[PDB]
C-alpha cells in the first residue's frame, strides 16, 4: 500500500505545516502537524479542557464506532520549545492520504499548554520519530509509520515541504518526479530515538565549503535550523547589521537585507538553502528588525535540521531494518 497527502503552511512564514488526517468511523478530519522529532499522535478532543480549546477541530471518540478506550493508558509530553500536553488514549482507524492503519493509538488531550491553545490551525501532532520515544504509559505505543510499515510497498516515507507553498508527505514510495538529480543517502543513529545523522559541512553564500561533521536531527516539527554557534556566527557575519539579541532570543537582522544562501553537506552532496528561506519577518508587527531562520543550538543540546533546511530538499526517511536518510535537491 501507499499514501500521499498534501501538507500546507499554517501561515505566511511557514511556521509549521498541517496535513489532513482521517480518524474514526465515520471519518473525522483533523489537521495535524507531522513531526519527525516526536512519536506521539495526539489530538484536541471532546475531552480537552474547554478553556484550552480556541478554534481547533476536535476528535470526539464517542462519535466513532471504531474507537476503543485503551484502558489505563495515559500520556504526557513536553516539547523542546517548552510546550506540553497530556491525556488518555483510544485506539481507532487512522488514514493519511489513502493509507489506513487500524488500531492506531490516538492520544486524546485532556490538557494542552497555552502555545497549543493559541494556535487555532493545529489540531494535534502526528509523530514520525522512532516509537521508542512514544510517551504512552504503561504500555508504549507505536507511531503511524511503525504500524503501517509492514503493509507499505517500501518501508519509507518522504517529506517534500514547500517554501511559502504546499508540499507532500508520501508513505510507501519514492516519487522520482519530485526531485532533481540523485538522492544521497546517509547513516542514521536511532540511539536517541530521532532521525539523527551527520552533515559533512557547510558553506555561506558563495563561500568555500567547510568540511566538518555536524551531528543533528531531521525534524519536520521544528521551524528553524539550529546549528553550532561557530557556524551560525559565520553565517550572520555576512549580513550587515545582523546581531544576536538576548531580548529577542536569537539572531535578528535588518529587514532591508538581502540574505545569503546556506549550504549543508550530505555525504559528498550539497543542499542549498536560498537566502529568502532564512527570513522569518519582523520580530513584531511593523518592526524593521527581522528574525533569522538560522539560530544557535547552544543550550538545546542537539543540532536540529528543521523546516528551514528540510524544505530545501526532498527528504527520504528510510525505515528499513537499518534506517537511513536520503536528501535530494528539487
Task: Offer a quick outline of the entry.
The PDB classes it as hydrolase. The protein has helices at residues 114-117, 144-148, 229-236, 307-310, and strands at 3-9, 17-23, 28-35, 41-43, 68-78, 84-96, 99-112, 124-127, 156-160, 167-171, 184-187, 196-204, 210-218, 225-227, 243-245, 250-254, 262-266, 269-273, 279-282, 289-292, 294-296, 303-305, 314-318, 324-328. It is mostly beta strands and 330 residues long.
Kindly describe this structure.
This protein is mainly beta and 330 residues long. Helix content is 6%, strand content 44%. It folds into two domains: 5-174, Beta Barrel (Cathepsin D, subunit A, domain 1); 175-330, Acid Proteases (Cathepsin D, subunit A, domain 1, Beta Barrel), CATH 2.40.70.10. The protein has helices at 114-117, 144-148, 229-236, 307-310; strands at 3-9, 17-23, 28-35, 41-43, 68-78, 84-96, 99-112, 124-127, 156-160, 167-171, 184-187, 196-204, 210-218, 225-227, 243-245, 250-254, 262-266, 269-273, 279-282, 289-292, 294-296, 303-305, 314-318, 324-328. This is Endothiapepsin. Residues 17-328 form the Peptidase A1 domain.
Share of β-strand residues: 35-45%
User: How many structurally independent domains?
Assistant: 2
Strand order of the largest sheet: 18-17-12-13-22-14-21
The H/E string reads EEEEEEEHEHEEEEEEHEEEEEEEEHEE
Q: Give the oligomer, counting copies of the same chain as homo and different chains as hetero.
A: monomer
Distance between the termini: 25 Å
Shape: globular
Keywords: Aspartyl protease, Disulfide bond, Hydrolase, Protease, Signal, Zymogen
Family: Belongs to the peptidase A1 family.
Enzyme class: hydrolase
GO molecular function: aspartic-type endopeptidase activity
Amino acid at each position: 500500500s501507499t499514501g500521499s497527502a498534501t501538507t500546507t503552511p499554517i501561515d505566511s512564514l511557514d511556521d509549521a505545516y498541517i496535513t489532513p488526517v482521517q480518524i474514526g468511523t465515520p471519518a473525522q478530519t483533523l489537521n495535524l502537524d507531522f513531526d519527525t522529532g516526536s512519536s506521539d499522535l495526539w489530538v484536541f478532543s471532546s475531552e480537552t479542557t474547554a478553556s484550552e480549546v480556541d478554534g481547533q477541530t476536535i476528535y470526539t471518540p464517542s462519535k466513532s464506532t471504531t474507537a476503543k478506550l485503551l484502558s489505563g493508558a495515559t500520556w504526557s509530553i513536553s516539547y523542546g520549545d517548552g510546550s506540553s500536553s497530556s491525556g488518555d488514549v483510544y485506539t481507532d482507524t487512522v488514514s493519511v492520504g489513502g493509507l489506513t492503519v487500524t488500531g492506531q493509538a490516538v492520544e486524546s488531550a485532556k490538557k494542552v499548554s497555552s502555545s497549543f491553545t493559541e494556535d487555532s490551525t493545529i489540531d494535534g501532532l502526528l509523530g514520525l520519530a522512532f516509537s521508542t520515544l512514544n510517551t504512552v504509559s504503561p504500555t508504549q505505543q507505536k507511531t503511524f509509520f511503525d504500524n503501517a510499515k509492514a503493509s507499505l510497498d517500501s518501508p519509507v516515507f518522504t517529506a517534500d515541504l514547500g517554501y511559502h507553498a504546499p508540499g507532500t508527505y508520501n508513505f510507501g514510495f519514492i516519487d522520482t518526479t519530485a526531485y532533481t538529480g540523485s538522492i544521497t543517502y546517509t547513516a542514521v543513529s536511532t540511539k536517541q530515538g530521532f532521525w539523527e545523522w551527520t552533515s559533512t559541512g557547510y558553506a555561506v553564500g558563495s563561500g568555500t565549503f567547510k568540511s566538518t561533521s555536524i551531528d543533528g536531527i531531521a525534524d519536520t516539527g521544528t521551524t528553524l535550523l539550529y546549528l553550532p554557534a561557530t557556524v551560525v556566527s559565520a553565517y550572520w557575519a555576512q549580513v550587515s547589521g545582523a546581531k544576536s539579541s538576548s531580548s529577542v532570543g536569537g539572531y535578528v537582522f535588518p529587514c532591508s537585507a538581502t540574505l545569503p544562501s546556506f549550504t549543508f553537506g550530505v555525504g559528498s552532496a550539497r543542499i542549498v538553502i536560498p537566502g529568502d528561506y532564512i527570513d522569518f519577518g519582523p520580530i513584531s508587527t511593523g518592526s524593521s528588525s527581522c528574525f533569522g531562520g538560522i539560530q544557535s543550538s547552544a543550550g538545546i543540546g542537539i543540532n536540529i535540521f528543521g523546516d528551514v533546511a528540510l524544505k530545501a530538499a526532498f527528504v527520504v526517511f528510510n525505515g528499513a531494518t537499518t534506517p537511513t536518510l536520503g536528501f535530494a535537491s528539487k
